[PDB]
Design a protein around this ligand. Structure first.
Ligand SMILES: Brc1c[nH]c(Br)c1Br
Lengths: 187, 187
């Protein structure tokens, strides 16, 4: 089980006020993560982050499939297997082509991804390591295939993953059964 | 100059609607960062994150000096020198004892920090690297000195640094002169 025994998640029926925050999460994921049930014990934190996370769904300048591919690559580059499994599970539940999702982590060589998607996923990878190894060539390629509005939404997803990677590491959230199967298949 | 030329920050007078977002930011810092001026080009994103950042000031279960100490250690462990300089500048404006702030990054051996503060800063450090090297002893030391409520607010600050480290790396925000002087003094 988890190394974290100090902060335990509440029961879902205990925090109905956070249902608008929960739906955005679980509609895409199919279940409510323990990280969000735990976050619910601080209503200021839960509501503020829930309002931030809805920006992912609201983003207009990049395709939906690219949003979760960016999230998969960002969580993987940070070594966050919990978030990597969650965003891969989201990608499989929302994408029509399961093969492109399973080839996400080889985007630099897999024929399912064009130069625009590779530019965004390479930026997300180099953005999410510690320290970030973002070089000038990453910025040039991102500017060559994406608008200023698209770039802001790309970086926002990367930064939101930064919150989720570190939050779920702090909770030592154990990978649920459904994302565990998805992550095993993709590896 | 900056490596990021695709997404440029706007003038402050251009987005007066975001003044509630700016004041909360610059009140702690003394000036308005380039990261938020750039984030202002997505007003939904800027406001959503501003509400997230206000939880740091709003936290009630840990002292103000430890909040910025956690942020300094977290940003440093992640190799985000921009965020490391900014949170150090906040500590100089808010802390009564400047000497304790300057010894923050040596908290494991400096006598300005007790075993409780070292447990929290060691957790923040191991939480913020990619991947996180959080072991069971971090959780035991955190649970021995902190309540569930305090742990949630600590992990929240670390996760908020996760957003900020990657956002300012994605923007390649250049270190301002006032944090640059603070960072040279502390190093
Ligand atoms: Br946006 C942003 C940039 N720097 C800092 Br401290 C924040 Br909050």
């Amino acid at each position: 089980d988890s190394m974290n025994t100090l902060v335990t998640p509440l029961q879902r029926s205990d925090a109905p006020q956070l249902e608008p925050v929960f739906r955005g999460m679980e509609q895409n994921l199919g279940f409510l993560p323990n990280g969000i049930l735990t976050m619910g014990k601080n209503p200021d934190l839960a509501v503020a982050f829930g309002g931030l996370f809805k920006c992912i769904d609201a983003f207009k300048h990049i395709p939906t499939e690219l949003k979760w591919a960016i999230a998969m690559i960002s969580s993987s580059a940070a070594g966050a297997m919990y978030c990597k499994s969650h965003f891969s599970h989201i990608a499989t539940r929302t994408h029509v082509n399961r093969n492109k999702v399973m080839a996400a982590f080889e985007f630099q060589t897999s024929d399912f991804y064009n130069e625009a998607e590779r530019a965004a996923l390479a930026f997300a990878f180099a953005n999410s390591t510690s320290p970030a190894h973002l070089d000038k060539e990453h910025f040039d390629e991102l500017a060559r295939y994406y608008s200023e509005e698209a770039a802001i939404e790309i970086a926002a997803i990367i930064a939101i993953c930064g919150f989720l990677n570190r939050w779920n590491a702090a909770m030592d959230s154990q990978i649920e059964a459904a994302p565990r199967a998805t992550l095993d298949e993709i590896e």
